[PDB]
Design an enzyme around this catalytic site. Structure first.
Site, PDB file in Angstrom:
ATOM      1  CG  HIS A   1     -13.375  17.167 -27.168  1.00 18.67           C
ATOM      2  ND1 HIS A   1     -13.909  17.020 -25.906  1.00 18.67           N
ATOM      3  CD2 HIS A   1     -13.189  15.916 -27.646  1.00 18.67           C
ATOM      4  CE1 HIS A   1     -14.025  15.733 -25.628  1.00 18.67           C
ATOM      5  NE2 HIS A   1     -13.593  15.043 -26.667  1.00 18.67           N
TER       6      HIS A   1
ATOM      7  CB  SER B   1     -13.369  12.533 -23.908  1.00 19.86           C
ATOM      8  OG  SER B   1     -14.530  12.549 -24.717  1.00 19.86           O
TER       9      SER B   1
ATOM     10  CD  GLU C   1     -14.946  20.176 -23.732  1.00 12.80           C
ATOM     11  OE1 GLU C   1     -14.687  19.280 -24.557  1.00 12.80           O
ATOM     12  OE2 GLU C   1     -14.319  20.302 -22.664  1.00 12.80           O
TER      13      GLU C   1
HETATM   14  C1  LIG Z   1      -9.914  14.130 -27.456  1.00  9.63           C
HETATM   15  O1  LIG Z   1      -9.834  13.368 -28.626  1.00  9.63           O
HETATM   16  C2  LIG Z   1      -9.509  14.108 -29.808  1.00  9.63           C
HETATM   17  C3  LIG Z   1      -9.898  13.304 -30.998  1.00  9.63           C
HETATM   18  N1  LIG Z   1     -11.345  12.951 -30.833  1.00  9.63           N
HETATM   19  C4  LIG Z   1     -12.407  13.799 -31.256  1.00  9.63           C
HETATM   20  C5  LIG Z   1     -12.653  13.869 -32.813  1.00  9.63           C
HETATM   21  C6  LIG Z   1     -13.926  14.507 -32.975  1.00  9.63           C
HETATM   22  C7  LIG Z   1     -14.396  14.515 -34.312  1.00  9.63           C
HETATM   23  C8  LIG Z   1     -14.402  13.110 -34.895  1.00  9.63           C
HETATM   24  N2  LIG Z   1     -13.118  12.491 -34.812  1.00  9.63           N
HETATM   25  C9  LIG Z   1     -13.236  11.347 -35.229  1.00  9.63           C
HETATM   26  C10 LIG Z   1     -13.631  11.306 -36.769  1.00  9.63           C
HETATM   27  C11 LIG Z   1     -13.170   9.961 -37.213  1.00  9.63           C
HETATM   28  C12 LIG Z   1     -13.599   9.071 -38.406  1.00  9.63           C
HETATM   29  C13 LIG Z   1     -12.940   7.705 -38.614  1.00  9.63           C
HETATM   30  C14 LIG Z   1     -11.848   7.236 -37.639  1.00  9.63           C
HETATM   31  C15 LIG Z   1     -11.425   8.128 -36.450  1.00  9.63           C
HETATM   32  C16 LIG Z   1     -12.093   9.486 -36.252  1.00  9.63           C
HETATM   33  C17 LIG Z   1     -11.881  10.536 -35.215  1.00  9.63           C
HETATM   34  C18 LIG Z   1     -12.628  12.492 -33.464  1.00  9.63           C
HETATM   35  C19 LIG Z   1     -11.682  11.675 -30.161  1.00  9.63           C
HETATM   36  O2  LIG Z   1     -10.805  10.917 -29.749  1.00  9.63           O
HETATM   37  C20 LIG Z   1     -13.213  11.362 -29.982  1.00  9.63           C
HETATM   38  C21 LIG Z   1     -13.931  10.495 -30.983  1.00  9.63           C
HETATM   39  C22 LIG Z   1     -15.411  10.194 -30.815  1.00  9.63           C
HETATM   40  N3  LIG Z   1     -15.993   9.356 -31.823  1.00  9.63           N
HETATM   41  O3  LIG Z   1     -15.163   8.744 -32.733  1.00  9.63           O
HETATM   42  O4  LIG Z   1     -17.173   9.173 -31.901  1.00  9.63           O
HETATM   43  C23 LIG Z   1     -16.188  10.817 -29.556  1.00  9.63           C
HETATM   44  C24 LIG Z   1     -17.623  10.570 -29.337  1.00  9.63           C
HETATM   45  C25 LIG Z   1     -18.313  11.175 -28.144  1.00  9.63           C
HETATM   46  C26 LIG Z   1     -17.555  12.048 -27.149  1.00  9.63           C
HETATM   47  N4  LIG Z   1     -16.138  12.301 -27.368  1.00  9.63           N
HETATM   48  C27 LIG Z   1     -15.456  11.688 -28.570  1.00  9.63           C
HETATM   49  C28 LIG Z   1     -13.982  11.981 -28.754  1.00  9.63           C
HETATM   50  O5  LIG Z   1     -13.307  12.803 -27.805  1.00  9.63           O
END
Ligand SMILES: COCCN(C[C@@H]1CCCN(C2Cc3ccccc3C2)C1)C(=O)c1cc([N+](=O)[O-])c2cccnc2c1O
Ligand SMILES: COCCN(C[C@@H]1CCCN(C2Cc3ccccc3C2)C1)C(=O)c1cc([N+](=O)[O-])c2cccnc2c1O
Ligand SMILES: *[C@@H]1O[C@H](CO)[C@@H](O[C@@H]2O[C@H](CO)[C@@H](O)[C@H](O)[C@H]2NC(C)=O)[C@H](O)[C@H]1NC(C)=O
Ligand SMILES: *[C@@H]1O[C@H](CO)[C@@H](O[C@@H]2O[C@H](CO)[C@@H](O)[C@H](O)[C@H]2NC(C)=O)[C@H](O)[C@H]1NC(C)=O
Ligand SMILES: *[C@@H]1O[C@H](CO)[C@@H](O[C@@H]2O[C@H](CO)[C@@H](O)[C@H](O)[C@H]2NC(C)=O)[C@H](O)[C@H]1NC(C)=O
Ligand SMILES: *[C@H]1O[C@H](CO)[C@@H](O[C@@H]2O[C@H](CO)[C@@H](O)[C@H](O)[C@H]2NC(C)=O)[C@H](O)[C@H]1NC(C)=O
Ligand SMILES: CC(=O)N[C@@H]1[C@@H](O)[C@H](O)[C@@H](CO)O[C@H]1O
Ligand SMILES: CC(=O)N[C@@H]1[C@@H](O)[C@H](O)[C@@H](CO)O[C@H]1O
Ligand SMILES: *[C@@H]1O[C@H](CO)[C@@H](O)[C@H](O)[C@H]1NC(C)=O
Ligand SMILES: *[C@@H]1O[C@H](CO)[C@@H](O)[C@H](O)[C@H]1NC(C)=O
Ligand SMILES: *[C@@H]1O[C@H](CO)[C@@H](O)[C@H](O)[C@H]1NC(C)=O
Ligand SMILES: *[C@@H]1O[C@H](CO)[C@@H](O)[C@H](O)[C@H]1NC(C)=O
Ligand SMILES: *[C@@H]1O[C@H](CO)[C@@H](O)[C@H](O)[C@H]1NC(C)=O
Ligand SMILES: *[C@H]1O[C@H](CO)[C@@H](O)[C@H](O)[C@H]1NC(C)=O
Ligand SMILES: *[C@H]1O[C@H](CO)[C@@H](O)[C@H](O)[C@H]1NC(C)=O
Ligand SMILES: *[C@H]1O[C@H](CO)[C@@H](O)[C@H](O)[C@H]1NC(C)=O
Ligand SMILES: C[C@@H]1O[C@@H](O)[C@@H](O)[C@H](O)[C@@H]1O
Ligand SMILES: C[C@@H]1O[C@H](O)[C@@H](O)[C@H](O)[C@@H]1O
Ligand SMILES: C[C@@H]1O[C@H](O)[C@@H](O)[C@H](O)[C@@H]1O
Ligand SMILES: C[C@@H]1O[C@H](O)[C@@H](O)[C@H](O)[C@@H]1O
Ligand SMILES: [Cl-]
Ligand SMILES: [Cl-]
Ligand SMILES: [Cl-]
Ligand SMILES: [Cl-]
EC number: 3.1.1.8
Lengths: 524, 527
Positions: free
Chosen positions: B436, B196, B323
């Site tokens: 994802h 990502s 995804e």
């Molecule tokens: C492979 O990762 C697995 C965990 N995720 C994916 C989750 C998806 C739904 C949201 N939560 C968030 C919610 C929330 C609220 C407060 C604190 C922490 C969090 C976590 C993370 C990520 O690390 C991650 C995060 C973002 N973002 O924060 O905008 C992406 C943006 C664009 C493309 N890709 C992203 C991405 O892959």
């Protein structure tokens, strides 16, 4: 050879057809000539005549503009009227087999055009083959076209609209009251027509007045839900005024506007018809059917959706390249004299011609849906793409749509897809299976072996001829060792292809393209 | 005792037991000065030296970041939450080495994902010890600053120029170039890989001239810079910095004082204001991410890509099947992890309005059109699966295929994969599919641990992927074995061949979702 009609006697002629004889009556009058003060009015009934009317020649054709785009070219001139033009044109033709029958089923032809042109006396509408080969009685009438037939001032009997439609209706009424004397069965009457004629047919299903005047319907490349078929009450009025202004007839009372129009030479009305609509394309219907509160008591789409129409069997279909004919009369880069290859942007100006009022977003959505190429190279992709756009929107999609909703009310509908190009077709090879070129096959023209058609074409013509005739007679378009033709149902939606090779049953005709026109284009 | 002499001093590691063998691990080697005090918002400063022995035996701090607490106690979400203390002092890295020590091992470097707002190198699923044991590669992973602390931007102003976190990554890559040989690594065989935002970061290192001598090949999992969320324009970074300053009471006239003011705020007050610098805000929002800084990125990435100004080398790229699903449960209406989340046409429509705030009402119907040509009308799951695929195709799959197309056109071998297996242990509901991020555990060889309740098919699959990934790194070709193995062909713009990854049958295929990507690449830019 003489038959007694209820308004006087008429004399016919003997025709020689494939070693046999067909009794033909050409030019029986069925209404008062709509001359002078009768111009723009509904047809008036005829009085009896004492002596004998000689129905031995095709009558006058109704006044109309003539296609002279290609002088000397047969492809266009075969549709031009082949008798003298005159406001005195309410006649019909009757063909009878010999010997004569006692209760033959009757096929009635309503010719096509854009409601602006056409006549029943064309070579391709010759019913003598149909009379000889399937022993049906064949009838065809002339009806008023253009402003003389479809000018509208709603509520005003001086020019109420749909006059040309009431002409057709009066001819059907004539058949009811006279056809028995010719050996016909008034309780087995089948309408068929092409394009505007097919749309005319579909309008007779809606109109209460026509309910009892026929039995079944055949619709070739046309229906009332075609975008070009029906003019709104408001846009008709705008065209009547545009015409009056163009003819020096602008007034305040409309009763007097009509009075002024009645003094104009027919040519002065005809030659101004093209200008009553600014966005003039070759698919423009300057003066056509409208909601007059008489022939059409309401909007056609509504009547169809509420199911208030004649409940009966129908046969419906279209050609493979319905659109091409209209592209050579205005679209840039197209010609009948070259292979007409066009570029992505030539495609774009084409779309602007056929969709004048549509946003550039919409003319891009269209461009999108029709460029998902199978082959990236071609280069004929766009030339065929624009063709398919016109064809699908103007003819193919409205027809499937009409057939779906008509079938939904428990009536048997049959759908065809005509895929064969004529070996004698005068247009270039890129135009494919053109608008109107199934007609010669329905009328049995290739059955004439001295006529330069292939054997394969005669066999095909015989099938269509047999199927059409059996549908008229029995309500089922079967042949003899022949592919069984299934009902079109809204669920499975099966249709039959017609070609020389192999007539197959298939499903969901061009369902992907029609998806766009039915469920997305209305939101642009 | 276990001690390696690095160019900054000596460091002590530990022995790990992995599948009857041993892996030497050095956890928490510092690679830069702590970005503290006046070093906040600045590019990483080089390290000097330490006299004694640094004890690399525990994971270091995670960089400051907001924590996902939408579902307290739920493993599905909390498995991504950092598992060490948070702190501005976080520029450390980890090194795993096979035993016996190698002579010239190929090195795999991991760049964690997130929205550039979260993440850390110490997660259980990022464990490099399996890869070192099973394939005898050296595995390196680093921490880089995320959120505003890593990507706040006042372009041209060395006090906060932007892309600090990317420069953090780059300095760790310099560290490998200068030290990895001492651990037995080949600095001339270095492969970046990430997922990502990690994948997006990787694709940016291909663009950035500064990184070009710091690695050999690249692997991109579910990410690339041409993704709509990956990169922020020069003006939109500046406007967000100012929004943040206003939100924290730091608005001034000169920028030097805004930065000076932001430097006095507690790390926590900057964190709590990050979400507000962007007016709309979806779960896919990258509040503070990479921008065109005129240093790390001299131009909009698309320009460099189209002009062929990037590192010429082999790439491995790919995506997962579902995804989009992960992001729908964090905001889209009607969705939950506790239901089958079956939704209606208009819930679908309000969903579309959540993820496309700036798009006309015309465009939100165009999308709907292109995505409702149902095979079975009912099928009540149609709309729920339609929305998943919309978010997924727009945000990950199409930009990835697009990147791979454009990259391959300059004459280097690219390979594309399509990951289709749902894990037997996935904590999320079945309707979210192949989510994802849940290929990562298969890439790191977790199912190879038989004591961990994965299926046998899953160990077979993991062992396969691990083999291909490691082989790509070493040879530039993701082969498994010469015999009894599916040939993985290069992705070319003409045929566009890719490989599917699952337990059933790994097949060769063409033109991944070409009909869907057609809409996004050649119509959506015209709305
Ligand atoms: C492979 O990762 C697995 C965990 N995720 C994916 C989750 C998806 C739904 C949201 N939560 C968030 C919610 C929330 C609220 C407060 C604190 C922490 C969090 C976590 C993370 C990520 O690390 C991650 C995060 C973002 N973002 O924060 O905008 C992406 C943006 C664009 C493309 N890709 C992203 C991405 O892959
Ligand atoms: C199947 O018959 C073959 C002959 N044609 C089709 C040709 C198509 C292109 C235009 N030309 C000619 C007509 C004419 C007359 C005077 C001067 C120049 C021209 C150009 C005719 C028709 O009779 C015909 C005509 C119209 N219209 O007038 O707009 C239709 C409109 C909507 C739906 N269907 C229409 C239709 O079928
Ligand atoms: C580790 O492997 C590299 C090759 O990747 C060895 O290479 C240098 O390699 C290049 C070609 O890749 C040659 O042109 C140079 O001449 C090599 N330098 C030397 C000093 O040999 C490198 O030597 C290996 N290191 C080991 C085995 O410790
Ligand atoms: C810069 O950021 C501003 C601040 O959010 C964006 O906003 C709009 O207009 C004024 C700013 O002068 C604000 O008071 C409004 O609240 C904002 N509109 C909305 C709908 O919130 C602005 O769009 C950004 N512009 C640029 C060029 O980056
Ligand atoms: C996978 O395929 C590659 C081919 O790209 C194989 O590579 C060769 O490996 C040997 C040593 O194992 C080297 O000496 C050669 O230089 C490599 N060939 C090249 C780089 O063209 C690799 O061995 C294969 N591995 C398996 C397990 O099948
Ligand atoms: C070569 O390797 C394949 C694996 O790619 C093996 O075939 C499999 O056999 C196991 C059971 O022994 C099955 O569970 C798998 O489904 C098989 N996979 C297939 C058939 O693709 C086997 O070790 C060897 N197969 C051959 C044909 O030599
Ligand atoms: C199919 C058929 O017979 N139609 C008519 C029938 O209605 C009528 O009774 C009789 C008149 O001659 O025959 C004819
Ligand atoms: C829609 C409207 O109000 N106006 C139309 C327009 O076509 C034109 O301005 C006028 C004269 O041609 O005819 C009418
Ligand atoms: C011509 O008309 C006569 C009756 O006048 C009729 O007997 C004959 O069948 C018709 N056809 C021929 C062969 O003349
Ligand atoms: C009708 O036809 C007959 C026979 O061909 C002919 O003598 C006559 O002139 C024609 N016209 C009238 C009015 O009888
Ligand atoms: C129409 O106008 C004519 C003359 O302009 C006039 O004689 C007649 O009374 C008018 N009719 C109506 C109904 O207005
Ligand atoms: C048939 O085509 C020939 C040319 O081969 C021509 O001479 C003849 O007039 C045509 N016949 C008809 C009836 O069209
Ligand atoms: C066609 O179908 C009709 C249905 O009534 C049937 O009577 C007839 O035998 C079939 N075949 C022909 C050649 O009409
Ligand atoms: C032929 O048609 C006209 C010339 O009459 C022209 O506009 C067009 O470019 C030509 N078409 C081709 C395919 O060259
Ligand atoms: C493990 O590391 C090496 C063996 O490869 C050696 O120092 C000793 O066996 C172990 N070291 C420990 C656990 O102190
Ligand atoms: C399920 O998720 C929550 C309740 O658990 C609610 O917001 C939503 O309406 C529900 N939807 C369905 C289809 O159960
Ligand atoms: C348990 C139910 O489903 C879940 C929540 O979205 C609702 O608020 C409700 O509490
Ligand atoms: C194009 C214009 O449309 C309107 C008419 O009133 C004018 O006469 C002209 O034809
Ligand atoms: C301070 C900023 O003003 C502007 C808005 O768009 C942001 O949401 C924020 O409130
Ligand atoms: C991973 C799979 O193993 C088994 C083989 O038959 C396939 O080709 C593939 O390599
Ligand atoms: Cl119209
Ligand atoms: Cl092992
Ligand atoms: Cl499900
Ligand atoms: Cl391979």
């Amino acid at each position: 050879i003489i038959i007694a009609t209820k308004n006087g006697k008429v004399r016919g002629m003997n025709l020689t057809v494939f070693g046999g004889t067909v009794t033909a009556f050409l030019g029986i009058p069925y209404a008062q000539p709509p001359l002078g003060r009768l111009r723009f009015k509904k047809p008036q009934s005829l009085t009896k005549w004492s002596d004998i009317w000689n129905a031995t020649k095709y009558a006058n054709s109704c006044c109309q503009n003539i296609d002279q785009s290609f002088p000397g070219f047969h492809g266009s001139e075969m549709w031009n009227p082949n008798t003298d033009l005159s406001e005195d044109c309410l006649y019909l033709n009757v063909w009878i087999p010999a010997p004569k029958p006692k209760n033959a089923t009757v096929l009635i032809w309503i010719y096509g055009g854009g409601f602006q042109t056409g006549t029943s006396s064309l070579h391709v509408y010759d019913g003598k083959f149909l009379a000889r080969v399937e022993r049906v009685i064949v009838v065809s009438m002339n009806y008023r076209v253009g402003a003389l037939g479809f000018l509208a001032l709603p509520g005003n009997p001086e020019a109420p609209g749909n006059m040309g439609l009431f002409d057709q209706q009066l001819a059907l009424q004539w058949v009811q009251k006279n056809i028995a004397a010719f050996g016909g069965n008034p309780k087995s009457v089948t309408l068929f027509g092409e394009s505007a004629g097919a749309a005319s047919v579909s309008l007779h299903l809606l109109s209460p007045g026509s309910h009892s005047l026929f039995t079944r319907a055949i619709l070739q490349s046309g229906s009332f839900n075609a975008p070009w078929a029906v003019t709104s009450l408001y846009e008709a009025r705008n065209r009547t005024l545009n015409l009056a202004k163009l003819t020096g007839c602008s007034r305040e009372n409309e009763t007097e506007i009509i009075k002024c129009l009645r003094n104009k030479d027919p040519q002065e009305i005809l030659l101004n018809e093209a200008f009553v609509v600014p966005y003039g394309t070759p698919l423009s219907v300057n003066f056509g059917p409208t909601v007059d509160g008489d022939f059409l008591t309401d909007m056609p789409d509504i009547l169809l959706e509420l199911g208030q129409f004649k409940k009966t069997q129908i046969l419906v279909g279209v050609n493979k390249d319905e659109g091409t004919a209209f592209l050579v009369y205005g679209a840039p880069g197209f010609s009948k004299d070259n292979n007409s290859i066009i570029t992505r942007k030539e495609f774009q100006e084409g779309l602007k011609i056929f969709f004048p009022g549509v946003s550039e977003f919409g003319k891009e959505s269209i461009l999108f849906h029709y460029t998902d190429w199978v082959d990236d190279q071609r280069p004929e992709n766009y030339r065929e793409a624009l063709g398919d756009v016109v064809g699908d929107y103007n003819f193919i999609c409205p027809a499937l749509e009409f057939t779906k909703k008509f079938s939904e009310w428990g009536n048997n509908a049959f759908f065809y897809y005509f895929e064969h190009r004529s070996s004698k077709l005068p247009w270039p090879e890129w135009m494919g299976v053109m608008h109107g070129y199934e007609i010669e096959f329905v009328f049995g023209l290739p059955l004439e072996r001295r006529d330069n058609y292939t054997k394969a074409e005669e066999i095909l013509s015989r099938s269509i001829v047999k199927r059409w005739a059996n549908f008229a007679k029995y309500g089922n378009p079967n042949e003899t060792n022949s592919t069984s033709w299934p009902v079109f149902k809204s669920t499975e939606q099966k249709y039959l292809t017609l070609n020389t090779e192999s007539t197959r049953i298939m499903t969901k005709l061009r369902a992907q393209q029609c998806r766009f026109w039915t469920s997305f284009f209305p939101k642009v």
